[PDB]
Scaffold this active site. Structure first.
Site: not given
Ligand code: VXE
Lengths: 253, 253
Positions: A6-7, A192
């Protein structure tokens, strides 16, 4: 082997839905008012509005990723192919990971709208105004402009059903593993919180969870949280990831 | 003008990984094995070995970055720092040190470690002070610490489970002694200490009776990592807008 993560931290989380009201003034001049706000945000074809639905990461979010990448470097984990969701935040993240790996120049990132999160979450009837790779590479971001996407923007759906999402992810993934199969044995995905359960659900071969214990299992995924799969045995399973996690708290008060 | 800047240390190891963090990053023979990317590449050895860390723990990786950024920020503003002191807590010396590192002044500013800027001691566990590393040992660890600085309140002269009134009073006497010993030698002074410090060192410096203790503690809890206040001489001193921007980020989640 496969790596999804995830970012970085989001500017629209830390600073509110009303966050452009704290960056920008009448004439749309960027003005940082906190130190976690970048020093320049890049200029957007559409103007400053495209952020509202497509927010960039904060300073600490970069570092989060630049650390993850440095960690990959130290653990002697060679990353051969990297694909990321078209979200600005997922592109900025991925570029910093590569800085950390020291491969901002060599590696070049496959952008792929198939990795984006369940559009149930999008506000209104309209998708975010993603920067096209030509314009991303334009802002000094190691991106691969050549890479033809395997699920084009236009082919995506504007507030989809649960099992449409899980299938397009477990569909896009199957494609990406085939895409490389013997062009390097380590592929990473920058995407995500939803991406981790959706794409490796079916890869490891499990039976997707109800639309209630997804949302359950997803909100429990930190920034730069990250997981490993390993198989032509046709049998993919999770492996303890090759790096350590990255837990900190907030600024406090 | 003449200015006094007081700010709080960075992120605390023993807050992000708990009272029993030592149980996480130290094994049986006593080797430090980092289990998280927010833990440092390695820890400095102590006169007492590692058990000395449980009452004087250090800043984390993001704590260092928090303070490298404040130093970057003061320097971007052409804010010149003439005088650095700091508490004898490891967390404050290390924070002080990274500030210098982002100021580009590790090799010219020497940190005056001053035990009278330690937090209110009713917050110390049990009935013995923490085993503070002496200046010479810190200088021996690449820490830009002035080892000839002669303190105004020495460690032997710090009481245990002291009173609120004691503390407010030593925080006031210290601050007036630092200021005067700088009255001619230079213009701006940076204290790196605890949340307690930002109130305790400045309330009486501006002509004010001091808060009652319950309210003192309510203020103190609202001060974040690297929170940073500012004081300017009118021999009374006034609070003012910092010369740099605030700094907010949140957890990893
Ligand atoms: C695991 C041990 C550990 C961790 C964190 C802390 C911590 O959070 N320390 C505060 C000051 C403070 C200390 C206290 O022991 N009790 C308090 C009560 C009210 C307000 C402040 C305090 C600060 O770092 O400023 C105190 C011990």
């Amino acid at each position: 082997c496969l790596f999804v993560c995830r970012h970085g931290e989001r500017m629209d989380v830390v600073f509110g839905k009303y966050w452009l009201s704290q960056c920008f003034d009448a004439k749309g001049r960027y003005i940082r008012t906190n130190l976690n706000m970048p020093h320049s945000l890049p200029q957007r074809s559409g103007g400053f509005r495209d952020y509202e639905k497509d927010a960039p990461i904060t300073v600490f979010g970069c570092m989060q990723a630049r650390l993850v990448g440095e960690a990959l470097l130290e653990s002697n984990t060679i990353i051969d192919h990297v694909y990321c969701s078209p979200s600005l935040r997922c592109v900025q993240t991925a570029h910093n990971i590569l800085k950390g790996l020291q491969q901002e120049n060599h590696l070049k990132i496959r952008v792929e709208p198939g990795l984006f999160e369940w559009t149930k979450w999008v506000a209104g009837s309209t998708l975010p105004a993603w920067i096209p790779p030509s314009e991303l590479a334009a802002a000094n971001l190691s991106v691969d402009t050549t890479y033809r996407p395997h699920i084009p923007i236009s082919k995506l759906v504007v507030s989809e059903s649960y099992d449409t999402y899980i299938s397009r992810s477990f569909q896009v993934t199957k494609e990406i593993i085939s895409e490389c199969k013997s062009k390097g044995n380590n592929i990473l995905i920058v995407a995500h919180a939803s991406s981790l359960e959706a794409c490796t659900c079916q890869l490891q071969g499990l039976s997707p969870q109800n639309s209630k214990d997804f949302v359950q299992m997803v909100r429990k995924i930190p920034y730069l949280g990250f997981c490993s799969c390993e198989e032509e045995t046709g049998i993919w399973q999770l492996t303890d990831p090759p790096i350590l996690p990255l837990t900190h708290g907030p600024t406090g008060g």
